[PDB]
Amino acid sequence: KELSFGARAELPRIHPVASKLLRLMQKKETNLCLSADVSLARELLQLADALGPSICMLKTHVDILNDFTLDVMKELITLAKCHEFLIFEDRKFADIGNTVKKQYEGGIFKIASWADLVNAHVVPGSGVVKGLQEVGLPLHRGCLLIAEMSSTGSLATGDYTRAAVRMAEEHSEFVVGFISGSRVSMKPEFLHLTPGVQLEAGGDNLGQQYNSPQEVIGKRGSDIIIVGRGIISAADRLEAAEMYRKAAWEAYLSRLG
Amino acid sequence: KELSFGARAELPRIHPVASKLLRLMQKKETNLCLSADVSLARELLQLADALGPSICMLKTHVDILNDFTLDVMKELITLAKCHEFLIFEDRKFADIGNTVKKQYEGGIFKIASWADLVNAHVVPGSGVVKGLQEVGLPLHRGCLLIAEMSSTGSLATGDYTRAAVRMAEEHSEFVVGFISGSRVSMKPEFLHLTPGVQLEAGGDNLGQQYNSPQEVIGKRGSDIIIVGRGIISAADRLEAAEMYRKAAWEAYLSRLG
Ligand SMILES: *c1cc(=O)[nH]c(=O)n1[C@@H]1O[C@H](COP(=O)(O)O)[C@@H](O)[C@H]1O
Numbered sequence: 001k002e003l004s005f006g007a008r009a010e011l012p013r014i015h016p017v018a019s020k021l022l023r024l025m026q027k028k029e030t031n032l033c034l035s036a037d038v039s040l041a042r043e044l045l046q047l048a049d050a051l052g053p054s055i056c057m058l059k060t061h062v063d064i065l066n067d068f069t070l071d072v073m074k075e076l077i078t079l080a081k082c083h084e085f086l087i088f089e090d091r092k093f094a095d096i097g098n099t100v101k102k103q104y105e106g107g108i109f110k111i112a113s114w115a116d117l118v119n120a121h122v123v124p125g126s127g128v129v130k131g132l133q134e135v136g137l138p139l140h141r142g143c144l145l146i147a148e149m150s151s152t153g154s155l156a157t158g159d160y161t162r163a164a165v166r167m168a169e170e171h172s173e174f175v176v177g178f179i180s181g182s183r184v185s186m187k188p189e190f191l192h193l194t195p196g197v198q199l200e201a202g203g204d205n206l207g208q209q210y211n212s213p214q215e216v217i218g219k220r221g222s223d224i225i226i227v228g229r230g231i232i233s234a235a236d237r238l239e240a241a242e243m244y245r246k247a248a249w250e251a252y253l254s255r256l257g
Numbered sequence: 258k259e260l261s262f263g264a265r266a267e268l269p270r271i272h273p274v275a276s277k278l279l280r281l282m283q284k285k286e287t288n289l290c291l292s293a294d295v296s297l298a299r300e301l302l303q304l305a306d307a308l309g310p311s312i313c314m315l316k317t318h319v320d321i322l323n324d325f326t327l328d329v330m331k332e333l334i335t336l337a338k339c340h341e342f343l344i345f346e347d348r349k350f351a352d353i354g355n356t357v358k359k360q361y362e363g364g365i366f367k368i369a370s371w372a373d374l375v376n377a378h379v380v381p382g383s384g385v386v387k388g389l390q391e392v393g394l395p396l397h398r399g400c401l402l403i404a405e406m407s408s409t410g411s412l413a414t415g416d417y418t419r420a421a422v423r424m425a426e427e428h429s430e431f432v433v434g435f436i437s438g439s440r441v442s443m444k445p446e447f448l449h450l451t452p453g454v455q456l457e458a459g460g461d462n463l464g465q466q467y468n469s470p471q472e473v474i475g476k477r478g479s480d481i482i483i484v485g486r487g488i489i490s491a492a493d494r495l496e497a498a499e500m501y502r503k504a505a506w507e508a509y510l511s512r513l514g
């Protein structure tokens with residue numbers, strides 16, 4: 001039956017990145033991942049600073065930052081360490097192994113130098129995980145596999161989802177869990193991170209679908225909610241982040257018994 | 258009955274980007290897309306200039322360029338216009354509509370500002386295309402959908418592939434074709450581009466698989482071969498590009514009549 005985050009952090013087969021994450025989740029009482037979908041470095045950093053105490057993780061799309069530099073990432077690393085959260089680059093790699101290795105290590109972004117976690121789609125087959133790990137393992141990084149998507153018409157279903165779970169099991173030295181809408185694996189060493197979350201049900205006008213923290217954490221058995229616009233679009237993002245943190249945490253407690 | 262590229266360029270439902278490409282393929286007698294997988298701007302520009310005459314298209318991975326600036330891309334466009342090839346950014350978009358829109362238009366890369374073509378995975382559902390098209394249509398761009406992949410263990414098969422074809426047909430305003438290992442649609446308005454191509458049998462150690470141009474174009478019915486390492490790793494890249502051009506071109510002619 002259901003183990004606490006602190007207990008999972010001590011599971012035998014647990015990745016040190018997952019263990020570090022589960023520990024600060026337990027310590028800070030948050031299972032909220034902020035999706036910091038903004039185009040300005042000054043806004044990203046002011047969000048990370050102010051909301052840092054409320055979150056276990058900050059999720060970035062650096063390819064959307066109009067003023068990206070590696071110095072912005074350095075300041076973000078300082079905030080992650082000071083407020084205690086992980087940095088997750090939402091790169092959604094979906095290319096052959098030979099290419100994703102360079103996209104993760106190199107270019108302008110040098111994602112691997114600053115991101116604790118990245119994610120990958122499984123559509124290319126396991127070579128995508130093998131390419132990323134050749135870079136990630138040396139650097140003690142973790143990866144999430146996209147077993148399910150939140151958007152209308154997603155093909156990440158059935159046999160596809162099963163393939164994701166299988167691939168994660170075969171590369172558990174590097175893969176720490178899933179992007180999914182539910183619990184897709186019974187193994188408690190794996191983390192389940194769920195995007196497509198807002199307090200009000202609904203969606204956007206480009207196929208995003210939203211479910212509540214209570215539905216996702218409490219009934220669907222996921223671990224962490226990933227929240228973008230639900231927080232970002234509020235006048236007071238701190239208040240918003242706290243609302244989401246409390247909903248996700250209490251749903252987690254109430255799942256625990 | 259198969260139409261020539263020049264005849265296809267004139268089909269009533271042809272996309273202007275597809276038309277421009279078909280015309281120059283006929284005019285230059287090339288159906289080779291160079292995959293310019295290099296890490297330096299001068300290397301990209303050098304290959305583009307030297308091999309421009311031999312190719313219909315130059316496929317880029319900007320996110321692997323150590324010294325990207327929009328100035329490099331201006332220089333690239335100059336070569337494209339001079340030697341007459343299309344620029345294809347192999348970004349392989351794989352996220353929700355709202356995000357991809359920003360990844361296509363914005364950030365440091367401003368992909369839509371310079372890429373005649375991009376491609377997208379269909380796994381997120383059709384919102385991925387709707388988001389891209391919001392930026393792509395005003396800028397007169399085209400998109401390819403990834404219907405099949407060249408790598409081992411690929412999940413882009415069966416109903417996934419059929420979903421890709423369906424999505425393309427329903428967004429023909431913007432979608433001009435497929436990344437696939439074979440012909441996936443009988444509609445001659447759609448282009449088929451095939452990566453995983455080398456003259457000799459084999460693969461790499463991260464799940465890539467190679468098939469020959471005669472196999473891919475002649476027997477499987479694709480239009481364009483995408484070749485990276487088979488050209489880039491050769492001592493004489495000009496002679497290597499010419500060998501692939503002549504192979505793909507003859508295979509096309511044989512299939513024709
Ligand atoms: C990625 C995968 C997925 O299945 N669903 C997603 O929404 N995403 C990314 O998560 C963020 C959600 O933001 P919001 O809808 O809460 O604003 C977003 O960054 C998207 O790229």
Ligand SMILES: *c1cc(=O)[nH]c(=O)n1[C@@H]1O[C@H](COP(=O)(O)O)[C@@H](O)[C@H]1O
Nearest residue numbers: 095096099292406407452453484485486
């Ligand atoms: C993308 C999709 C796919 O199914 N197969 C692919 O190989 N790619 C991309 O195409 C290029 C292949 O290069 P090479 O193996 O000929 O060197 C590469 O850029 C890869 O990202």
